[PDB]
């Protein structure tokens, strides 16, 4: 029964201004074994191979830049981009000599690194690796039309980006046994529809206005009532005309909040820190010792 | 007004995610906890912290999904932020704190303070979230936009597609002009993302029938190196395979020096998913001989 779990603590190293994730298990010394995945996978692909090797050797399995749990900087993600990031990853880890275990585009990276660093490679295990394919007749007939479409302008991006054809189509098509839903979800995870700007939209939809949404209205009314009764020392900064706290609200708070000091900061709307940070910071500093 | 952000990054793992935070000033004493709101980050506090750090530890987290913190798959409702900030505070082992809070950071800070009243030694606040009884009390110059933000479909087109909260509201809500350097700090966490670009670029780099020529030459070059190199080699292959069918495995057995070959049985391309135990155990048996 082939394992679906990924029982590996995350490790990250900063590389050319981004972070790359990697598996790092086994002893600390000896020759490390460096596992390189390809498209559209991650170190997840090695999850059931690493445990055979970890008892005797250090196992390092990075996620290529833009993949797995690695950062996704704004690159073209051409082969040369992957070369740069993997080169810097190996150097950031201070690796000397390695054994390579490589697959697909990770094999193009590994072989290219090995050719440039032959003294540092003690062995290469490889499988289903990138070699020059002399004609499309040498490409498997059952996947020829699809890969030709991937390489066809516009249509390739529709299939791979809009329809996720490489994860939903190629990946199970190129495994003989059936992948489970848990396994597909691990492969889907780095490429789900991005969170992106969701937090910025959800916040205004939570603002407590005219009783709605009711759960936030109740919670905010509760802490406003707490503030009205609490002896906690309070410091209010307000600007004019303000947004949430106009002058009239500042005066209401002066009437209603115990133990309140109020500072007017001058012109201000909502992000008062951008209009008079020096007064805000200096007044906080002056107020803090009075809290002893 | 300074535009730089001269604070070393710190990260802490919270509920499976990394949260970024500023941590400056003395390492002990009561800490001052700065909480930003929408659509900002610890960057909002960059010119206020230096007044406070001489006397007190200053901690300024980026809320989950914002700043340099991770972006897990959440709804990003208020309750999500409550959970991650609660766990952030406990992860740092904070006991008593002074709060300095703004906007949704004030809703988070006041709500935390009410639930933990023994641990709050003071609260500084500004432009904070309070119950707004009617839209009448929302300033007219921003009222239509916030009504639109809360309208189905329209609100997402504005905030997500057009970045209205960063490109519109943020400078609308500062009296002086924000500089482009400041705008770029505020834009950075929310730049249009990379997404699936690597998945499409890879098949367009495959060396097939000579193209693309730069990859063809590079791949030919390392294949020529492999054919002359004495390095120990171990090839796993399956049937029918994809890139390495049986006839190609046989050709490699003839042409590569110092090669051991292992047939794994049925296999196409991701052989690790069809026979991981044979691949892993054969690598383990092979490594001592190196
Ligand atoms: Cl908001
Ligand atoms: Cl590919």
Task: Identify which of B50, B128, B266 has the shortest CB distance to residue A244.
Answer: B128
Is B111 considered catalytic here?
A: no
Strands B97-102 and B120-128: parallel
With residue A19 as reference, give the H or E element that holds it: strand A18-25
State residue B199 phi and psi, 5-degree precision: -65, -30
Least Cα distance to A273 among B44, B109, B105 occurs for: B44
Resolution value in angstroms = 1.7
Considering only residues 169 to 198 of chain B, which have any Cβ-Cβ distance to chain A shorter than 8 Å?
170, 172-176, 178, 182, 190-198
Superfamily of domain A11-131: Alpha/Beta hydrolase fold, catalytic domain (3.40.50.1820)
Nearest CB neighbour to B280, from listed A51, A267, A284: A51
* Separation of alpha carbons B112 and B21, rounded Å: 18
Residues B38, A204 contacting (CB under 8 angstroms): yes
The domain segmentation of chain A, as residue ranges, is 11-131, 232-292
Count other C-beta atoms under 10 Å from residue B28's C-beta: 7
Which residues from chain B sit within 8 angstroms of residue A273, using beta carbons?
A: 44-45, 47-48, 102, 126
Please answer whether residues A279 and A263 qualify as being in contact, where contact means their C-beta atoms are separated by less than 8 angstroms. Answer: yes
DSSP string for A20-82: EEEEEES-SSS--EEEE--TT--GGGGTTTHHHHTTTS-EEEEPPTTSTTS---S----HHHH
Instruction: Tell me the backbone φ, ψ of residue A12, rounded to 5 degrees.
Output: -135, 145
Q: Does the CB of A248 have a partner CB in chain B at under 8 Å?
A: no
- Measured between beta carbons, which residues in chain B are less than 8 angstroms from residue A101? 283
CB B89 within 8 A of CB B112: yes
SS3 B125: strand
Q: Tokens in use for B169?
A: 């509201």
CA distance B41 to A274: 13
Residues 6+ apart with CB under 8 A from A69: A10, A12, A21, A42, A63, A190
Contact B235 A126 (CB under 8 A): yes
Q: How was this structure determined?
A: X-ray
Q: Do B222 and A112 touch (CB under 8 A)?
A: yes
SS3 letters for A107-123?
Answer: HHHHHHHHHHCHHHEEE
Token digits of residue B168: 């519109």
Dihedral sign (CA B217, B220, B226, B229): negative
Q: Which residue out of A125, A215, A227 would a mutagenesis test of the B interface target, given it has the greatest number of B Cβ atoms within 10 Å?
A: A125
Catalytic residue among A128, A138, A212, A249: A128
Ligand at minimal distance from the CA of A143 is 2
Report residue A38 as tokens.
């390809």
- By three-state DSSP, how is residue B260 classified? strand
Residues constituting chain B: 290
Residue of B nearest to A199 (CA): B76
Cβ-based neighbours of B34, under 8 Å, separated by 6 or more: B22, B42, B45, B48, B49, B58, B59, B60, B100, B101, B105
Separation between Cα atoms, residue B221 and residue A59, nearest integer Å: 28
Q: What is the dihedral of CA B238, B242, B243, B248, to 10 degrees?
A: 50
SS3 A15: strand
B1-130: what CATH class? Answer: alpha beta
The answer to whether the Cβ–Cβ distance between B155 and A56 falls below 8 Å is: no
Q: Kindly list the distances between the CA atom of residue B92 and the CA atoms of B11, B101, B123, B205, in Å, as whole numbers in the listed order.
A: 10, 18, 19, 46
Residue A2 contacts by C-beta under 8 Å, 6 or more apart in sequence?
A48, A177, B273, B276
What separation in Å is there between the alpha carbon of B198 and the centre of ligand 2?
A: 9
Compare CB distances from A129 to B173, B175, B244 and report the shortest one's residue: B244
């Amino acid at each position: 029964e082939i394992g679906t779990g990924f029982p590996f603590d995350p490790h990250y190293v900063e590389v050319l201004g981004s972070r790359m994730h990697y598996v790092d298990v086994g002893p600390r010394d000896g020759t490390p074994v460096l596992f390189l995945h390809g498209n559209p996978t991650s170190s997840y692909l090695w999850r059931n191979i690493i445990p055979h090797v970890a008892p005797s050797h250090r196992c390092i399995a990075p996620d290529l830049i833009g993949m797995g749990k690695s950062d996704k900087p704004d690159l073209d993600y051409r082969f040369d981009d992957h070369v740069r990031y993997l080169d810097a990853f190996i150097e950031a880890l201070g690796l000397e000599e390695v054994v390579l275990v490589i697959h697909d585009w990770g094999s193009a990276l590994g072989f290219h690194w090995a050719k440039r660093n032959p003294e540092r490679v003690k062995g290469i295990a490889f499988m289903e690796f990138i070699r020059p394919i002399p004609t499309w007749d040498e490409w498997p007939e059952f996947a020829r039309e699809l890969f030709q479409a991937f390489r066809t302008p516009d249509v390739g991006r529709e299939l791979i980006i809009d329809q996720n054809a490489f994860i939903e189509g190629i990946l199970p098509k190129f495994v003989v046994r059936p992948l489970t839903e848990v396994e597909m979800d691990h492969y889907r995870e780095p490429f789900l529809k991005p969170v992106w700007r969701e937090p910025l939209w959800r916040f205004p939809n939570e603002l407590p206005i005219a009783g709605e949404p009711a759960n936030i209205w109740a919670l905010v009314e509760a802490y406003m009532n707490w503030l009205h009764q609490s002896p906690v020392p309070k410091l209010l900064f307000w600007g004019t005309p303000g947004v949430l706290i106009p002058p009239a609200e500042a005066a209401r708070l002066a009437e209603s909040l115990p133990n309140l000091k109020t500072v007017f900061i001058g012109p201000g709307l909502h992000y008062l820190q951008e209009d008079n940070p020096d007064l805000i910071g200096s007044e906080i500093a002056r107020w803090l010792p009075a809290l002893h």
